[PDB]
Structures are given as structure tokens and as C-alpha cells.
Amino acid sequence: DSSRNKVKETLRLFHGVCRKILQEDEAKPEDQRRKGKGLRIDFEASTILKRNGKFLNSGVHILGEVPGVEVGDEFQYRMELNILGIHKPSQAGIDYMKYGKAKVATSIVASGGYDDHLDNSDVLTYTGQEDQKLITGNLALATSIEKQTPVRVIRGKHSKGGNYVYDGLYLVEKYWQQVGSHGMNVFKFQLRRIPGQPELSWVEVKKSKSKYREGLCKLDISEGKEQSPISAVNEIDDEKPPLFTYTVKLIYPDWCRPVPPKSCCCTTRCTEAEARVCACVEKNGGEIPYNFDGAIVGAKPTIYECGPLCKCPSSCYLRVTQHGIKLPLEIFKTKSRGWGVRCLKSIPIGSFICEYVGELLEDSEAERRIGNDEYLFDIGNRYDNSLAQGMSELMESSGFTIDAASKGNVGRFINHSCSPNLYAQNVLYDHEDSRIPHVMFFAQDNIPPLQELCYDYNYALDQVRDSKGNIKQKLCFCGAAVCRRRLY
Numbered sequence: 001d002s003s004r005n006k007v008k009e010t011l012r013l014f015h016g017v018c019r020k021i022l023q024e025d026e027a028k029p030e031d032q033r034r035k036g037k038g039l040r041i042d043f044e045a046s047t048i049l050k051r052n053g054k055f056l057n058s059g060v061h062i063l064g065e066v067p068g069v070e071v072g073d074e075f076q077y078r079m080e081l082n083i084l085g086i087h088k089p090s091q092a093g094i095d096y097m098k099y100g101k102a103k104v105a106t107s108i109v110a111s112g113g114y115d116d117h118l119d120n121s122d123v124l125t126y127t128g129q130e131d132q133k134l135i136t137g138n139l140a141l142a143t144s145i146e147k148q149t150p151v152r153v154i155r156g157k158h159s160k161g162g163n164y165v166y167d168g169l170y171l172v173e174k175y176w177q178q179v180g181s182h183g184m185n186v187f188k189f190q191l192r193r194i195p196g197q198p199e200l201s202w203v204e205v206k207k208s209k210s211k212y213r214e215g216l217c218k219l220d221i222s223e224g225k226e227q228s229p230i231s232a233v234n235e236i237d238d239e240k241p242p243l244f245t246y247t248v249k250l251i252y253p254d255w256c257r258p259v260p261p262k263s264c265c266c267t268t269r270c271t272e273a274e275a276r277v278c279a280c281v282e283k284n285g286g287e288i289p290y291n292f293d294g295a296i297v298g299a300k301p302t303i304y305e306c307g308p309l310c311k312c313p314s315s316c317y318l319r320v321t322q323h324g325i326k327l328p329l330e331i332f333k334t335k336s337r338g339w340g341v342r343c344l345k346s347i348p349i350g351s352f353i354c355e356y357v358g359e360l361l362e363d364s365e366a367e368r369r370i371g372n373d374e375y376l377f378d379i380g381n382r383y384d385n386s387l388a389q390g391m392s393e394l395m396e397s398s399g400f401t402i403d404a405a406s407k408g409n410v411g412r413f414i415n416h417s418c419s420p421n422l423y424a425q426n427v428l429y430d431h432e433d434s435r436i437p438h439v440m441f442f443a444q445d446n447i448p449p450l451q452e453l454c455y456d457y458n459y460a461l462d463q464v465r466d467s468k469g470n471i472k473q474k475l476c477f478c479g480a481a482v483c484r485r486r487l488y
């Protein structure tokens with residue numbers, strides 16, 4: 001029930017610790033950094049979580065589906081498999097457990113180039129293990145043929161971007177022996193995916209790359225304004241996306257034209273390591289809030305980026321959300337929540353998605369809203385310090401509203417979930433007005449491709465009111481195992 005949430009939170013804690021350790025290394029002068037000399041942030045984070053009892057399913061083998069782990073789930077590090085107890089061994093490709101007097105495989109890691117042909121997508125050929133011997137793992141995978149017991153398959157790319165993918169449950173059908181190219185016998189196993197499971201994510205991505213893709217009903221809702229086109233897909237009905245004036249960047253009315261923020265004195269990328277003063281690093285409380293790869297280290301009340309009069313180059317480490325969308329986004333028709341947003345590739349945890357763009361207005365003007373309050377985003381105090389607290393145990397609301405009813409960007413189409421994979425992060429760079437930060441969405445999960453993007457709308461129950469002025473209700477259809485059942 002809450003096992004999905006405990007899995008996601010466990011991973012979130014792991015990656016938070018990883019990015020903290022890495023931040024710590026990136027703050028050091030290049031000469032004293034450990035990244036070169038065998039820094040293993042995954043192993044340190046792993047150790048920290050283990051020594052605090054954070055590992056799930058430890059000391060127990062599971063055959064078949066693991067609670068809270070779903071088909072399509074992606075992992076950046078192999079040790080995540082260890083932390084969740086999906087796949088116990090540190091290095092070995094095959095994991096197994098006792099079954100009667102024998103042993104059957106519970107899990108395999110097919111690391112590498114995988115076959116990408118669509119008419120064989122349910123079938124997998126797996127190499128075993130100078131001759132390979134029918135012992136331990138190989139023997140267990142062979143016994144799986146006799147028992148017809150399910151095997152978990154994890155696809156491993158030969159880093160950071162969707163390195164391990166859980167592809168679901170397979171049955172082992174046969175095995176044989178042949179000379180490998182190293183010159184000795186190896187074992188080969190044929191597995192078949194069990195019918196009834198969600199489609200493989202690589203299959204969906206592959207089908208999505210075609211121009212004859214099912215349901216494709218618009219090439220670019222951006223109308224050529226975003227640097228990459230944002231398409232629209234509808235496999236549900238024949239409805240087309242709502243019309244609105246697409247707006248890439250937030251445009252300030254004259255009542256809040258930016259007063260020029262306090263600038264920067266660095267001729268190159270800002271970092272803690274370079275020792276002369278950077279004002280923008282002090283704005284962030286003496287830290288760089290991003291890792292050097294662009295990922296947010298961890299949610300904060302406010303992040304300060306370098307602005308228009310900082311002498312920094314575009315690739316400064318404090319310049320991230322200001323460069324706009326980089327992911328290949330698209331909107332698509334949901335069954336019961338109107339239009340939603342998703343991405344055509346994996347999104348690494350910590351990645352910036354997009355801004356909530358629209359017309360800025362004061363609250364008072366906000367309470368007089370007529371027409372569409374579906375696209376009203378109230379700024380102020382969405383910061384969630386849960387993760388920061390959890391990690392510490394290991395180691396002012398705003399009146400203003402963004403109205404995207406008439407003018408906005410793709411962010412207006414992002415739906416609500418009670419178990420969200422995104423969060424809202426306040427960012428300042430072209431001004432220092434605390435009342436009206438940019439609302440920047442970041443990933444708080446490693447997001448598999450084509451998984452719907454969602455954040456917490458954070459409405460208070462029984463405070464959303466009628467056209468005539470009284471309490472209104474709306475049900476939440478987010479489908480999460482722990483759904484709070486009402487949107488407002």
C-alpha cells in the first residue's frame with residue numbers, strides 16, 4: 001500500500017545523499033578532489049543507508065513481483081538493486097534462492113546492447129556465468145526451466161541516464177551450450193516475457209519515434225517558439241489540444257518590471273573552489289545548489305542563479321533553469337484528467353523540467369478571477385523539507401498568482417498526483433523579488449520515459465470556492481496507492 005512510497009522515498013534518500021557527497025567534492029579545489037582518485041558516492045551513500053537500517057527486503061529473497069517496484073522502473077546505480085533487494089549480488093548477473101531441494105533464479109541483469117527488434121520484443125537471449133559450468137547461478141537459471149518459476153529481468157546499458165531498467169517477469173524456456181568468442185563453452189538461455197504486463201519502455205519509445213505514431217495530432221503546440229517542438233498525442237478520442245498563446249519566457253507587466261539584481265564578479269563558471277568572492281554563491285548560503293552536471297542537489301526555499309549582469313559565461317554552474325527546456329517533452333490525452341505532460345526519454349533525478357509560465361497577477365486581482373482557475377498557480381511556500389530532515393538524521397507564503405489560462409507554456413498542462421514525480425522550486429536570477437520567484441519544476445525521481453509528469457497542486461481542502469461563492473469539491477483521479485481522494 002505505502003510500499004510504493006517507501007520504495008520511492010528510499011531511492012530519494014539514497015540519491016540525495018549521493019548528490020550531497022558529490023556537492024562536497026565539487027566544492028574542493030580541482031587538486032584536492034576525490035572524483036579522480038576513486039570516489040564512489042554510490043558506495044558511501046549505500047554504506048550510510050545500510051548502517052541506518054534503510055535497506056528494504058534485506059536478507060529475504062523474493063520470487064516474482066517485488067512490492068513497490070513496478071515494470072519500467074529505472075535506476076542510476078546497480079547498488080540501488082541491492083538497496084531494494086531486487087537483485088542481491090554486487091557483481092554477478094544472476095541471483096537465485098532455494099526452491100525445495102533445488103535453487104531457481106529470482107533475478108538477472110542483462111547488461112549490454114540488447115536486441116531492439118519489435119517482433120521479438122517478448123523474447124530475450126541471455127548468456128550465462130574457462131568453460132562455463134552448470135553450477136550456482138547457471139544451474140539455478142536452468143532449474144527455472146523445470147519449475148517454470150518467474151525471473152525478474154533488469155536491462156543494463158554498457159553513469160547517470162536510465163542505466164538500469166526493470167523490464168518485468170520472464171520464464172526460462174530452454175538453454176544450450178556453445179563456443180563463445182573467447183574460445184570456450186558458454187551457456188545460453190532463452191527467456192519469454194510473461195503475457196499481461198505493461199509494455200516494455202524501449203518498445204514504447206521506439207514506436208514513439210515514428211512519424212506514423214498512433215494518435216499524433218499536433219507537431220508543435222509551441223508553434224515554433226520552443227527550441228525543440230512539443231507534440232501532442234491523443235489515443236483516447238479525436239479531441240485536439242486547447243488553444244492558447246504559447247509563451248516561452250515569463251514576461252513581467254510594468255507594475256513589476258525587474259529592478260536590476262546584485263550581480264557577479266567571476267569571469268568564468270562560478271564555483272566554491274575558485275577562491276575569490278562570488279556574491280551569487282553567498283546568496284545561496286555559501287553553497288552551489290546544483291551539481292556540475294546541472295542537477296539540483298536538493299530542494300530549498302529559494303535558489304539564486306546568476307543573472308543578466310553577472311560576467312559569467314552561459315555555462316556557469318549557477319545558470320540552469322534560466323536556459324529553459326532541454327528535455328523532449330510532449331502533451332498527451334489521459335483517460336480522465338484531460339491533457340497531461342510526459343517526456344520521450346528518461347529524466348535523471350534532480351533534472352530541471354520546465355517553468356510554470358503565465359501572466360503575473362496580485363492576489364486581490366486573483367480572488368476576482370473569472371473564467372479559468374484551472375490554470376491559476378498560486379506561488380508561495382510549497383517547499384518540502386522532508387528529505388532534508390531525513391538526511392540530517394543520516395549525516396513566508398506569497399500573495400501572487402501565475403495565470404496561464406490565456407498565455408502560458410507546456411507547464412500549464414502538468415497534472416496533480418498524490419504521489420508526484422516532480423516538485424516546484426522557487427528560483428531567482430533576473431530580479432530579487434521574493435514575492436514573485438520563478439516557479440521551476442524539478443524531478444524528484446528517476447523518471448522512466450513516457451511516464452506522466454506530475455506535482456502536488458497543494459490545494460487546501462474546502463477553500464476552493466464557487467462562481468456564486470461557496471465550497472466546491474473535486475475528486476482526485478491520480479491513481480496513487482495513497483491518494484488523498486480530493487483535489488480540493
Ligand SMILES: C[S@@+](CC[C@H](N)C(=O)[O-])C[C@H]1O[C@@H](n2cnc3c(N)ncnc32)[C@H](O)[C@@H]1O
Nearest residue numbers: 337338339374375412413414415416476477478
Ligand atoms: C493546470 S490544469 C492541467 C492540465 C489539464 N488536465 C488540461 O487538460 O488542460 C488542472 C486541471 O486538470 C485536471 N486534473 C489535474 N490533475 C488531476 C487529478 N489528479 N485528478 C483529477 N483531475 C485532475 C483538473 O480538472 C484540474 O482542474
Ligand SMILES: [Zn+2]
Nearest residue numbers: 270306312316
Ligand atoms: Zn555565475
Ligand SMILES: [Zn+2]
Nearest residue numbers: 264266270278
Ligand atoms: Zn560568480
Ligand SMILES: [Zn+2]
Nearest residue numbers: 264280306310
Ligand atoms: Zn553571479
Ligand SMILES: [Zn+2]
Nearest residue numbers: 418476478483
Ligand atoms: Zn490523488
